[PDB]
Ligand SMILES: *[C@@H]1O[C@H](CO)[C@@H](O[C@@H]2O[C@H](CO)[C@@H](O[C@@H]3O[C@H](CO[C@H]4O[C@H](CO)[C@@H](O)[C@H](O[C@H]5O[C@H](CO)[C@@H](O)[C@H](O)[C@@H]5O)[C@@H]4O)[C@@H](O)[C@H](O[C@H]4O[C@H](CO)[C@@H](O)[C@H](O)[C@@H]4O)[C@@H]3O)[C@H](O)[C@H]2NC(C)=O)[C@H](O)[C@H]1NC(C)=O
């Protein structure tokens with residue numbers, strides 16, 4: 001989405017509002033993945049819960 | 052009989068190319084060969100002056116953008132032979148993604164060209180790389196077929212031998228493939244480049 | 251929008267042809283490109299994917315599917331960044347600075363996937379053989395030590411590569 | 421696998437048949453060396469000539485037509501679409517030989533085959549006009 005965000009616009013040298021929105025959303029996704037990595041780092045036993 | 056053309060200086064010297072003025076992007080102008088002659092037609096005979104500019108293509112762009120991703124995809128597919136045979140989803144991911152990437156490269160290779168109906172050296176190289184990747188996938192499929200028990204080695208166990216809880220042995224197919232596939236790919240690359248570069 | 255005119259220059263001279271000499275005026279501009287668009291478009295995804303690739307070190311060796319999915323996805327994203335870059339450029343025969351940077355990032359993620367494969371081969375491949383038999387580089391028996399070494403080395407090597415790249419091309 | 425007969429028609433714009441009449445010579449249409457031609461996706465089979473009279477509001481005009489027969493070459497499209505689709509079908513077949521306990525592996529294989537087949541489907545029609553019938 002970030003790569004294809006600005007297909008039509010001229011290759012300007014400043015960040016637009018859409019660019020900032022895309023950056024913040026990607027930051028949210030990256031934070032979610034890092035959070036999952038942190039959670040998995042503290043999983044002592046690798047078998048799930050039985051019914 | 053009415054008009055005849057000729058070259059002012061000698062034919063080689065009568066077609067001069069400016070040194071700085073070379074607008075070619077992916078071609079090297081080796082030289083020019085000049086000639087004059089005659090042509091028949093329904094209206095009569097005409098004196099025709101011909102030049103031929105000899106241009107050699109530059110392989111750097113294609114080596115960077117098509118051949119080298121193909122080689123890296125082949126190596127990525129061949130890396131799958133080193134993981135344990137019980138890593139079924141992982142090795143399936145290797146095979147599937149490598150096949151998809153090679154399909155994408157095969158699709159994108161033809162974009163640079165006109166839609167000619169014959170096969171090129173790039174097409175043959177992509178076909179052989181696809182054959183190698185698919186062969187690696189089928190090799191993993193056979194390894195999974197011959198895999199007996201679906202749980203991997205615990206690590207602490209003192210494995211018995213091969214003539215309680217049992218564990219799978221390292222696949223003979225994997226052991227052979229680890230040295231067979233890269234060797235065959237390297238020999239193919241050697242033969243292909245030796246055939247095509249020197250001509 | 252892309253360039254800035256550092257300076258302009260006027261020149262007057264005489265150019266010689268086969269017919270004869272002629273007067274000649276030349277009006278030159280020295281354009282310098284702006285890097286903000288490229289930083290937003292190509293680079294910043296490349297670095298962020300490079301940090302993404304190193305998450306596989308913190309995942310346990312036995313969890314093979316997660317690390318494999320991470321490595322393969324990072325390689326795929328590097329490839330799609332590269333192709334969406336090259337789709338909009340001429341067919342020049344030499345490597346650009348951005349191409350060199352993309353190749354470096356690709357090499358880094360490739361080494362991440364390959365060192366995961368090396369850890370897997372050490373554990374499951376040489377494990378039973380060794381058991382039946384029974385900065386400095388780490389010991390090649392402890393997968394945890396190998397993971398820690400990768401954790402501390404990959405960011406350092408990537409930072410050094412970025413440092414030399416920027417200090418060379420700027 | 422299509423063969424077309426593309427026409428090339430010409431006539432007098434202003435003068436009807438009562439004023440100007442066109443006629444083909446004995447050597448009507450001459451084709452030169454047909455190997456220096458730009459035709460990549462098609463092959464020239466032959467040509468023929470015809471003459472007719474077309475009714476219009478202004479009057480009757482003698483229209484001279486030359487038809488060129490062109491047969492498509494399927495090598496390029498065979499490389500582009502047919503071979504990848506068959507290879508992806510075989511890739512789908514490979515799921516059969518996987519152990520049925522490999523649930524994520526087989527599911528990923530099947531869905532990825534579906535992805536690639538959809539991608540090839542949308543890519544195959546890029547070179548064509550947006551016609552509303554099955555080829
Ligand atoms: C983009 O790229 C282009 C191409 O490279 C750049 O253009 C070049 O710019 C330079 C200047 O930056 C130009 O150099 C000069 O030429 C002028 C005019 O000279 C002509 O006329 C003279 C008198 O009629 C004649 O003598 C010259 O002949 C040769 O003669 C001299 C002396 O014999 C010889 O030494 C040279 O080899 C000449 O080839 C020529 O026909 C000239 O006035 C300039 O002199 C400067 O330097 C001398 C030092 O010797 C100094 O004393 C002067 O006061 C003056 O400062 C200089 O020689 C060059 O011609 C341009 N080339 C082209 C192809 O246009 C352009 O600059 C780039 N852009 C930018 C933004 O930089």
Ligand SMILES: CCCCCCCC(=O)OC[C@H](COP(=O)(O)O[C@@H]1[C@H](O)[C@H](O)[C@@H](OP(=O)(O)O)[C@H](OP(=O)(O)O)[C@H]1O)OC(=O)CCCCCCC
Nearest residue numbers: 189193197198199213218219220221222223224227228231
């Ligand atoms: C296109 C289709 C092609 C079909 C190819 C079909 C190829 C084919 O038929 O393989 C047969 C077999 C496979 O070897 P493979 O490593 O899987 O051997 C079995 C495997 O090791 C099991 O794990 C063993 O049980 P366990 O874990 O110890 O409990 C079992 O022993 P046991 O149960 O009897 O005790 C073994 O049989 O032998 C070859 O090595 C092939 C060499 C040539 C490979 C060449 C590779 C380049």
Ligand SMILES: *[C@@H]1O[C@H](CO)[C@@H](O[C@@H]2O[C@H](CO)[C@@H](O)[C@H](O)[C@H]2NC(C)=O)[C@H](O)[C@H]1NC(C)=O
Nearest residue numbers: 443444445446447448449450467468469470471
């Ligand atoms: C083009 O049209 C002319 C006129 O219709 C065709 O002329 C005939 O050609 C044959 C073979 O030379 C002759 O035997 C006939 O006598 C010609 N017609 C007349 C009315 O005299 C010519 O063959 C056509 N060329 C083609 C079909 O390629």
Ligand SMILES: CCCCCCCCCC
Nearest residue numbers: 034037038041304305308
């Ligand atoms: C990519 C760097 C972040 C990886 C997760 C680190 C978790 C550390 C827990 C002590």
Ligand SMILES: CCCCCC
Nearest residue numbers: 182183186231232235
């Ligand atoms: C080209 C495929 C080679 C396979 C070797 C076992």
Ligand SMILES: CCCCCC
Nearest residue numbers: 185186187189190193
């Ligand atoms: C052509 C695939 C061969 C796989 C190893 C037997």
Ligand SMILES: CCCCCC
Nearest residue numbers: 119120123353356357
């Ligand atoms: C496109 C990736 C190339 C990597 C070469 C080291």
Ligand SMILES: CCCCCC
Nearest residue numbers: 361362364365366368
């Ligand atoms: C032998 C492969 C090593 C990968 C980088 C640690």
Ligand SMILES: [Cl-]
Nearest residue numbers: 075076077078
């Ligand atoms: Cl060119």
